[PDB]
């Protein structure tokens, strides 16, 4: 959309907020060696798995959030379509279906 | 003693110009309702205003009448007409007071004549009412003058007989 | 000779070739091969710190050489010199040193290195030979004759008399080796040897003697510079390298690489501390981390390894050292016999003697020429033929000898005479007398 | 999409005059430019009943626009129209104004 719109989007609006949120889970969890997922500079990196979930969720969540941009009081539901059954289905979720 | 009431109205209040008879025998239709005289008020929104309940006239005709043709000629031009009415009650030609009243052309069904003379009835009815108006001026003038007009200059000459 | 000129010669020549040998003898450098490298962003290869290096010397090489020397000589029946004076020395000696010296001189040159070897005069003045690492020096001719190289000077630094590192250089002169202090730049009168002391590297009897040739003449010796000692060594060193690497791989393979795809777990600072304490491995997140684990292909790697080893094998050393099929070869003699490990050494040893065996003889005659006595080739003089020898004959012959003595048919003594152990029939006689006396 | 954007529609306010009196000669002011997506309520155009949309005022929705709404005239492309309503932020990441309700609704004297 418009840059302003992008700014309006919460995720875009707060790079920091979005950026920060992932690593809390990420940083401890992954190996964690840590597989550094970080530069020496300390530029943050986001896990693939985390990224996929996060990006998908975040992208939806903003859409769900609206406002613009949000479902109408009487409207079709953005929620149903975007929210993964499918993406959840991605990663299985069970994964390697079996153990 | 000269008893005569002439018919005369050019157009303006009472016409202000005499015409010779038929004679208006006498009558006042009304004037109950308001009735509207020339209302004098200041800072007022005159009322009821231009309306008249009506007028009544009775007429008599004599064998020789003149200006009947003239009236028709007058008619052709056409206009609103406001006649004089003169009562009896010690009305001298000079002396007599007259009430302008209001006049309507419209109603003259016919003239009926007895052998001795022909009598005509004319009634003057104003069309109304408008609740709102406004002549405005004319009746105001009519009443003002009607209070005391200039009276029957012609008839003074008459009563020769 | 001006110092600079001498110095200049030193620098250009490259130390490496002898150095590699010198280092090689101590051990081959596992390190370079051994450590794995990783690719940086630059992508320049950097060796990882972690990998340790192991290198081993080869036992085998040492054994061969020692055995070789003794076997080859076979101990000459006798040595003679054409010159009376030389002969007089010779008879008494009989070598005694001389044969050893000849063997040593040839052997040493044949030995690993030198590449360039310069004899030094001993304090005693008896010939002492020591080998120093290459400068390596540039061959140059100190003397007018360009073709000959009087010597190429080398300098090496050793730490340290001071205990502080200092550069050291030694000039070497035909007369004798020279030692110079770097700091001084020279010690003693550089220009003079001299005259004495230092004493001459070698002295003639009664007078100073000069070779007439000044050390050192560089040894190619062959383009390979494969020989002599290096002959075993070069192959051996490579063998060690491969073997060493293999062993390391085994250890590395065993140790463990779990690797976990997932899952955390705490940030590694926390993780390490807890992990050590726990000393347990659990999988966070979804259960189980196959993670490869390391590898399916590892098994395949073994196949590669076998293939690699197989390729190695064909070229490979690991001498069979199988027991001889041939019967006989009684055990004691067998052990010495089997290689053992004469055969390999002997051929080279023969090489040591000849070619140049004739040359040595000629040289010996030349020595006589130095004597100024008429020179006869030592073979001519006795006349002697070399090698008769026959040490080898002795083995077969002795068996016959045992029979011969026992039978008494023959010689016996002459059979002994072949050596002769002794000409004197007397030993035989004694038995005969004993027999006659008996009983 | 829109990007930092004007609609582009310029908004100006149109008042007959600023005074108690109304009508009479008219002055124009440019309150500000604003961008809005305006489709008149103008019947849903489902037209189920399809009786509506009557309302005298026109509903315009302009994101985050205090100014555009009533007590200010709206202009699009310099075109002038007047609308009435009450601004609202129905939805959107950024609040977007809207007009609620209508006046002079159904049923007449």
């Amino acid at each position: 959309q418009r840059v302003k719109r992008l700014l309006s989007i919460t995720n875009d609006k707060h790079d920091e907020y979005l950026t920060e949120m992932v690593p809390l889970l990420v940083e401890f969890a992954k190996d964690e060696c840590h597989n550094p997922f970080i530069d020496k500079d300390g530029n943050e990196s986001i896990p693939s798995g985390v990224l996929i979930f996060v990006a998908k969720a975040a992208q939806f969540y903003m859409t769900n959030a609206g406002l613009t941009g949000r479902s109408m009081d009487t409207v079709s539901y953005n929620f149903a379509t975007e929210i993964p059954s499918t993406i959840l289905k991605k990663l299985n979720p069970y994964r390697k279906m079996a153990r | 003693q000269d008893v005569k009431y002439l018919f005369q109205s050019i157009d303006a209040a009472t016409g202000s110009a005499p015409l010779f008879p038929a004679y208006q025998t006498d009558g006042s239709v009304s004037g109950e309702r308001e009735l509207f005289d020339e209302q004098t008020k200041n800072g007022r929104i005159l009322g009821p205003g231009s309306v008249a309940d009506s007028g009544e006239v009775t007429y008599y005709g004599k064998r020789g009448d003149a200006g009947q043709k003239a009236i028709e000629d007058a008619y052709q031009n056409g206009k609103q007409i406001k006649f004089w009415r003169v009562d009896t009650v010690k009305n001298e030609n000079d002396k007599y007071d007259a009430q302008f009243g209001f006049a309507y052309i419209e109603s003259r069904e016919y003239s009926d004549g007895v052998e001795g003379a022909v009598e005509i009835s004319i009634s003057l009815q104003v069309i109304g009412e408008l609740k709102n108006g406004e002549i405005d001026t004319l009746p105001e003038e009519i009443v003002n003058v009607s209070k005391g007009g200039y009276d029957f200059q012609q008839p003074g000459q008459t009563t020769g007989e | 000779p001006d110092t600079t000129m001498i110095q200049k010669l030193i620098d250009e020549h490259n130390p490496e070739p002898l150095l590699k040998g010198v280092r090689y003898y101590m051990c081959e450098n596992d390190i370079e091969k051994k450590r794995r490298t990783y690719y940086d962003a630059a992508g320049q290869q950097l060796v990882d710190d972690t990998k340790t290096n192991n290198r081993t010397s080869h036992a085998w090489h040492k054994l061969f050489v020692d055995q070789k020397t003794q076997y080859l000589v076979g101990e000459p029946v006798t040595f003679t010199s054409d010159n009376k004076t030389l002969l007089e020395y010779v008879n008494e000696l009989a070598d005694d040193d001389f044969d050893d010296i000849l063997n040593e001189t040839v052997k040493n040159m044949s030995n690993k290195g030198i590449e360039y070897w310069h004899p030094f005069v001993d304090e005693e003045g008896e010939f002492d030979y020591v080998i120093f690492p290459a400068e390596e020096m540039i061959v140059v001719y100190k003397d007018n004759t360009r073709r000959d190289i009087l010597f190429a000077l080398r300098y090496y630094s050793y730490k340290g008399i001071m205990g502080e590192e200092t550069q050291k250089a030694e000039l070497y002169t035909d007369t004798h080796v020279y030692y110079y202090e770097k700091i001084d730049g020279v010690y003693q009168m550089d220009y003079s040897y001299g005259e004495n002391n230092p004493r001459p590297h070698m002295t003639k009897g009664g007078q100073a003697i000069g070779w007439g040739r000044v050390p050192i003449i560089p040894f190619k010796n062959n383009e390979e510079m494969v020989s002599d000692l290096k002959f075993y060594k070069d192959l051996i060193d490579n063998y060690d390298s491969i073997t060493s690497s293999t062993m390391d791989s085994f250890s590395d393979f065993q140790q463990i690489v779990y690797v976990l795809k997932n899952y955390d777990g705490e940030n590694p600072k926390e993780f390490t501390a807890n992990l050590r304490y726990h000393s347990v491995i659990k999988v966070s997140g979804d259960g189980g981390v196959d993670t490869l684990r390391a590898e399916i292909p590892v098994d395949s790697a073994a196949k590669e390894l076998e293939r690699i080893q197989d390729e190695l094998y064909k070229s490979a050393q690991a001498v069979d050292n199988s027991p001889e099929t041939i019967g006989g070869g009684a055990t004691g003699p067998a052990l010495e016999k089997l290689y053992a490990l004469l055969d390999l050494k002997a051929n080279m040893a023969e090489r040591k003697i000849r070619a140049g065996l004739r040359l040595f003889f000629w040289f010996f005659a030349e020595y006589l020429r130095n004597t100024g006595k008429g020179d006869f080739n030592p073979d001519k003089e006795l006349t002697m033929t070399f090698t008769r020898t026959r040490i080898q004959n002795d083995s077969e012959i002795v068996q016959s000898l045992v029979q011969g003595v026992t039978g008494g048919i023959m010689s016996k003594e002459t059979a002994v005479a072949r050596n002769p152990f002794v000409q004197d029939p007397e030993e035989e006689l004694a038995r005969i007398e004993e027999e006659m006396n008996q009983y | 999409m829109y990007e930092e954007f004007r609609d582009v529609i310029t908004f100006q306010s149109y008042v007959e005059q600023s005074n108690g009196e109304g009508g009479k000669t008219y002055k124009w002011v440019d309150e500000f430019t604003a961008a809005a997506h305006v489709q008149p309520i103008s019947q849903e155009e489902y037209y189920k009943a399809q009786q509506l949309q009557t309302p005298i005022g026109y509903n315009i929705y302009t994101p985050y626009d205090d100014r555009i709404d009533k007590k200010m005239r709206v202009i699009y492309r310099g075109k002038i129209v007047t609308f009435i309503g009450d601004p609202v932020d129905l939805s959107g990441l950024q609040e977007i104004t809207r007009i609620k309700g209508k006046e002079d609704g159904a049923y007449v004297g």
Partner: protein, 133 residues
């Protein structure tokens, strides 16, 4: 004297209406005029049960306005102003010299029905007479 000037006052009347800021917006009209449907409160304006009658005559000298309101848009605005002014003027009979005028007549009717169940609307009728007919 008043004559046309009295008519002029009507012009003045126009002026005040324009002078009324809220006057522009509704303009008045809503709820009155269409948009009656529009949500309560809704007030309309118009004569009560008025259909043209009589021909070739003025409807009447006096002009009467009927107000039918829901949500009571403005009996009050007209009423209050009129009342205050009227009250002062009144307490004195309306008469002209030589003439009498009466305000005729008074009719009062009120009916309210609320489909919504909104509080009952009230209807007030006002009649004005200017000048005699």
């Amino acid at each position: 004297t008043w004559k046309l000037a009295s008519r002029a006052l009507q012009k003045a009347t126009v002026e005040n209406l324009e002078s009324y800021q809220p006057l522009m917006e509704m303009v008045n009209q809503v709820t009155e005029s269409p948009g009656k449907d529009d949500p309560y409160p809704y007030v309309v304006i118009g004569d009560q049960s008025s259909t043209p009658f009589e021909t070739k005559s003025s409807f009447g000298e006096n002009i009467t306005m009927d107000f039918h309101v829901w949500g009571g848009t403005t009996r009050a605005e007209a009423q209050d102003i009129s009342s205050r002014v009227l009250e002062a003027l009144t307490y004195k009979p309306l008469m002209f010299e030589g003439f009498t005028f009466v305000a005729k007549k008074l009719v009062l009717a009120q009916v309210i029905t609320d489909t919504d169940g909104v509080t009952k609307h009230g209807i007030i009728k006002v009649r004005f007479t200017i000048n005699n007919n």
